[PDB]
Amino acid sequence: QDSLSFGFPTFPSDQKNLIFQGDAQIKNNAVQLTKTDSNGNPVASTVGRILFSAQVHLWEKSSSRVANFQSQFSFSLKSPLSNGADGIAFFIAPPDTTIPSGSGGGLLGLFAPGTAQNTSANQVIAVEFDTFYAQDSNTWDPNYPHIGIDVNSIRSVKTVKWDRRDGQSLNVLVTFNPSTRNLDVVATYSDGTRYEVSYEVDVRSVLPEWVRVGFSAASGEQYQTHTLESWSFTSTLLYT
Amino acid sequence: QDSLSFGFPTFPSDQKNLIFQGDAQIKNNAVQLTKTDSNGNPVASTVGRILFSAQVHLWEKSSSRVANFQSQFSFSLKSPLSNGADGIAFFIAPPDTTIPSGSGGGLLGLFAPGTAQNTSANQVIAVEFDTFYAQDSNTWDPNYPHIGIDVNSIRSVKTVKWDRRDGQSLNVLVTFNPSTRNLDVVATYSDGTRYEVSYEVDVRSVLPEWVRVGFSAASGEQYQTHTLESWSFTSTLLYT
Ligand SMILES: CO[C@H]1O[C@H](CO)[C@@H](O)[C@H](O)[C@@H]1O
Ligand SMILES: CO[C@H]1O[C@H](CO)[C@@H](O)[C@H](O)[C@@H]1O
Numbered sequence: 001q002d003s004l005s006f007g008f009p010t011f012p013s014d015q016k017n018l019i020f021q022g023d024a025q026i027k028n029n030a031v032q033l034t035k036t037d038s039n040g041n042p043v044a045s046t047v048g049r050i051l052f053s054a055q056v057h058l059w060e061k062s063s064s065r066v067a068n069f070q071s072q073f074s075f076s077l078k079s080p081l082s083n084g085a086d087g088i089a090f091f092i093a094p095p096d097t098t099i100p101s102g103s104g105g106g107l108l109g110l111f112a113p114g115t116a117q118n119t120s121a122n123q124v125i126a127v128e129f130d131t132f133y134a135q136d137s138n139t140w141d142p143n144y145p146h147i148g149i150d151v152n153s154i155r156s157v158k159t160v161k162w163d164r165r166d167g168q169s170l171n172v173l174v175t176f177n178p179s180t181r182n183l184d185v186v187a188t189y190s191d192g193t194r195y196e197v198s199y200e201v202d203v204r205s206v207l208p209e210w211v212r213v214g215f216s217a218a219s220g221e222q223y224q225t226h227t228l229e230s231w232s233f234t235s236t237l238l239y240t
Numbered sequence: 241q242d243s244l245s246f247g248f249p250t251f252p253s254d255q256k257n258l259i260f261q262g263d264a265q266i267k268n269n270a271v272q273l274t275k276t277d278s279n280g281n282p283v284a285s286t287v288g289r290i291l292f293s294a295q296v297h298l299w300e301k302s303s304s305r306v307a308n309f310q311s312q313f314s315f316s317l318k319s320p321l322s323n324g325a326d327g328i329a330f331f332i333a334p335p336d337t338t339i340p341s342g343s344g345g346g347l348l349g350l351f352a353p354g355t356a357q358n359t360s361a362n363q364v365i366a367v368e369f370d371t372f373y374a375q376d377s378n379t380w381d382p383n384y385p386h387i388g389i390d391v392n393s394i395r396s397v398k399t400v401k402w403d404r405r406d407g408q409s410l411n412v413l414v415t416f417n418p419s420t421r422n423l424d425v426v427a428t429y430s431d432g433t434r435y436e437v438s439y440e441v442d443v444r445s446v447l448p449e450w451v452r453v454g455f456s457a458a459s460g461e462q463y464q465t466h467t468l469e470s471w472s473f474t475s476t477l478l479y480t
């Protein structure tokens with residue numbers, strides 16, 4: 001299809017079009033990307049991802065068209081600690097993508113250790129909400145919580161300082177305009193606190209014509225829940 | 241997802257989200273439901289169907305909601321014979337639906353001979369464009385080409401006279417309003433000729449909560465091409 005859209009105001013237990021990978025599962029009408037115990041508390045060493053089953057036509061070589069897409073979602077992070085880790089990310093990748101071996105903790109379940117910073121060895125575009133930046137383990141991160149745009153590497157091509165608020169939902173809007181090639185990210189808390197980051201990228205030189213979209217989250221030695229509360233997505237192939 | 245929509249203005253050969261059954265295949269940016277030889281001419285004894293891969297949430301028992309959906313599509317039929325057969329149908333059925341054994345010809349690839357008229361043995365809602373009505377073989381049909389609404393039986397709960405026009409595209413809009421429970425069908429030819437038929441049906445008592453949507457066509461002894469040219473579909477769960 002030239003156009004595709006779907007909306008999940010909430011996440012009921014009976015899902016049919018979601019691919020669950022790792023520890024991801026539905027609980028209380030929301031997607032818990034990372035594992036939790038019987039009482040709902042986060043645990044260490046856990047990775048989980050979800051992808052929508054239908055493939056998205058991102059660009060078409062024959063017609064020279066590229067899709068304009070918009071992804072709106074909200075999530076909340078909770079932790080008995082304060083140094084919650086490691087973060088959640090919205091990502092776009094080839095349809096057969098699976099959790100790479102040893103991609104836990106700071107790699108967010110998106111990259112393999114040996115190639116995490118090798119741009120010619122990956123095919124992924126992601127928007128990360130990174131809460132852990134210890135310079136000994138996450139050597140690629142700026143020294144503060146941040147939202148970043150990742151293009152084939154865990155070392156973001158662009159970041160903006162961000163504030164982690166335990167238990168508060170963050171509303172996010174990610175848009176890609178093929179005309180200007182800008183990937184824009186706008187995140188806001190209910191009180192109006194806003195964060196923005198953008199970057200120019202030609203998706204055609206990074207990803208295949210057909211892709212899958214979804215979310216990934218992980219917790220290494222430090223932990224927190226990564227609760228995806230709602231998600232809507234729309235893509236339309238356009239001539240520019 | 242509570243809402244889902246997709247649009248195929250045309251059908252490029254590079255498809256990823258369509259389930260092809262029987263002889264259905266893409267040719268010249270269109271879906272040829274029934275088999276055609278190397279010259280593009282229709283042949284006898286063929287059946288084909290296509291379904292969108294993602295499942296549609298038609299209704300939700302827990303929330304007491306039912307979907308409002310709209311399906312817009314265009315197709316054309318062509319045959320050198322004076323009595324092209326058998327017809328094409330837009331249908332909604334359980335996700336695991338497959339072509340029934342011996343469902344060729346007048347059964348349109350939708351029903352098995354032994355239960356074709358047993359409403360308690362089927363789970364399907366279809367809108368058929370039936371061009372073959374020989375009273376000796378298709379005993380259930382009115383004696384003329386027709387558009388019919390089928391609910392668990394090849395014997396339409398309702399039909400209206402229709403004119404078959406060789407090689408001319410028919411544009412159709414099928415809508416279902418959960419508030420009135422009306423399934424409306426409006427079909428038009430490019431010269432303004434219009435056909436309309438409506439039927440009241442509670443989809444909750446006929447189909448499961450999750451379904452798949454698609455098209456089916458067949459040719460028995462008589463034949464014609466059944467070419468699906470475009471298709472857009474949208475569904476959203478609403479409070480009833
Ligand atoms: C100590 O390092 C581990 O724990 C931190 C915090 O969870 C992760 O960022 C890192 O990748 C390792 O898994
Ligand atoms: C003669 O009967 C056969 O051919 C007609 C026309 O194709 C079909 O309607 C029917 O089901 C049989 O297959």
Ligand SMILES: [Ca+2]
Pocket residue numbers: 086087106130131132133138141
């Ligand atoms: Ca980090």
Ligand SMILES: [Ca+2]
Pocket residue numbers: 326327346370371372373378381
């Ligand atoms: Ca018939």
Ligand SMILES: [Mn+2]
Pocket residue numbers: 128130140141142148154156
């Ligand atoms: Mn980071």
Ligand SMILES: [Mn+2]
Pocket residue numbers: 368370380381382388394396
């Ligand atoms: Mn009929």
